[PDB]
């Protein structure tokens, strides 16, 4: 049920770790956007994936591109996790309604109540140009993300 | 509405911070149970309340009594929070379905997606003998909790 390439990316307005509202449409005309859905703060695979994003942030957050992480945790969880891990990119809360944005992108695990490892690249017109979804026990290849953003510069 | 004194405490089975299963019925015939519902890990007032509980734990967790903290966070959140705070009592996850136990006890905040500051004492036969609910911005008086437990030894 993952939204595929060519679809309009569902707009959302979610709180980041500072309780600031972030809207996907705010980036239109300005930047390509990488959306990194993931299961849960303070779990091993998620830590590894976001640590790698952190460690390569200039490839993902720059004049051409922005990166947003999205999970079902509320802002205080994300704030502690980001501060302790050195994450400076936005971590957005798909918290209440629980998983609504993850559901809209077709990447919600209804059984477990978490997003799967869904990744999208949204172009400057708001269209999905890259889409994948791995299971919670898998790890994503971030080369695909940089390959996808490079095609839209 | 909050369940009242006299009512039978709804049964539940929830995961603790170590992903072990805790059931309310398990304590029947053995211990009085203090149920401490609270909004969110890693927030100020919740930290104060559970730190006070921690600092006086032998008054709540002993031969006669058990104490269970319940919130909408998942176990990994509660594991980190408990490790960093030195909490050795169970923190239970009312995570998915989101707030279901909190709703059964009548202490869920539907607008915010969190439990209010609901507290119950369940006697050895499963009957609610103490019941309160404060708002997220309020702080409970833990003297009432120790008094309630002391009446039931």
Distance between CA atoms of residues B72 and B70, nearest Å: 7
Cβ contact B77–A41 (<8 Å): yes
Q: Which of B54, B61, B53, B72 is nearest to B115 (CA)?
A: B72
Contact in structure between A42 and B80 (CB atoms under 8 Å): yes
Alpha carbon distance A44, A68 (integer Å): 19
Residue A48 in contact with partner chain B when CB distance is under 8 A: no
Compute the nearest-CA separation of B11 from chain A (Å).
21
Is B74 touching A (CB cutoff 8 A)?
yes
List of chain B residues whose C-beta atoms are within 8 Å of the C-beta of residue A42: 76-77, 79-80
Q: How many domains does chain B have?
A: 1
Q: Collapse the DSSP code of A145 into the 3-class scheme (helix H, G, I; strand E, B; otherwise coil) and give the result.
A: helix
DSSP 8-state class, residue B26? G
Asked if A79's CB is within 8 angstroms of B77's CB, the reply is no
Radius of gyration of chain B (CA): 14
Active site residue B68: no
Alpha helices in chain B (DSSP H): 44-55, 75-85, 100-104, 143-150
Contacts (Cβ under 8 Å, ≥6 apart) of A139: A45, A48, A49, A117
* Relative orientation angle of helices B75-85 and B44-55, to the nearest 10 degrees: 60
Instruction: For A89, list phi and psi in degrees, rounded to 5.
Output: -80, 160
Let me know: does B72 contact B102? Beta carbons within 8 Å: yes
What A142-151 contacts at long range (C-beta under 8 Å, 24+ apart), as own/partner pairs, is A142/A49, A142/A52, A142/A53, A142/A56, A144/A119, A145/A34, A145/A60, A145/A119, A145/A121, A146/A59, A146/A60, A148/A121, A149/A32, A149/A34, A149/A59, A149/A60, A149/A64, A149/A65, A149/A121
Which helix or strand (DSSP H or E) is residue B69 part of? strand B65-71
Q: Which residue has the tokens 């993300």?
A: A145
d(CA B89, CA A120): 40
Query: Which residues, numbered 24 to 43 in chain A, qualify as contacts with chain B under a Cβ-Cβ cut-off of 8 Å?
Result: 40-43
Domain CATH number, residue B33: 3.40.30.10
SS3 B5: coil
Nearest Cα to B72, choosing from B134, B142, B136?
B136
What was the structure determination method?
X-ray
* Angle between helices A44-55 and A142-150 in degrees, nearest 10: 40
B95, closest residue in chain A (CA to CA)? A113
Tokens of B3: 């369940």
Task: Using the structure block, give the residue that is written with the tokens 């979804």.
Answer: A133
Q: Is the dihedral of CA A53, A55, A57, A60 positive or negative?
A: negative
- Residues of B within 8 A of A79 (CB-CB) are 42
Distance in Å from the first CA to the final CA of chain A: 28
Question: Resolution in A for the shown PDB structure?
Answer: 1.5
**C-alpha separations of A28 from A19, A123, A124, B67, B82 in Å:** 22, 8, 5, 50, 41
Among residues B9, B46, B91, B133, the one annotated as catalytic is B46
Q: Which residues of B touch A76 (CB under 8 A)?
A: 40-43
Mutation test of the interface with chain A: which of B45, B71, B77, choosing the one with the most A Cβ atoms within 10 A?
A: B77
Q: Is B133 helix (H, G, I), strand (E, B) or coil?
A: strand
């Amino acid at each position: 049920s993952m939204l595929n390439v060519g679809a309009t990316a569902p707009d959302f307005t979610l709180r980041d770790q500072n309780q600031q509202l972030v809207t996907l449409r705010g980036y239109r005309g300005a930047k390509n956007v990488l959306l990194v859905f993931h299961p849960l703060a303070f779990t091993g695979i998620c830590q590894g994936e976001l640590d790698q994003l952190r460690d390569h942030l200039p490839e993902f957050e720059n004049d051409d591109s922005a990166a947003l992480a999205i999970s079902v945790g509320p802002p205080p969880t994300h704030k502690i996790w980001a501060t302790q891990s050195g994450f400076t990119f936005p971590l957005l809360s798909d918290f209440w309604p629980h998983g609504a944005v993850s559901q809209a992108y077709g990447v919600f695990n209804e059984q477990a109540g978490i997003a799967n490892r869904g990744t999208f690249v949204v172009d400057r017109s708001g269209i999905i140009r890259f889409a994948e979804m791995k299971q919670p026990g898998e790890v994503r290849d971030q080369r695909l993300w940089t390959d996808a953003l490079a095609a839209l510069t």
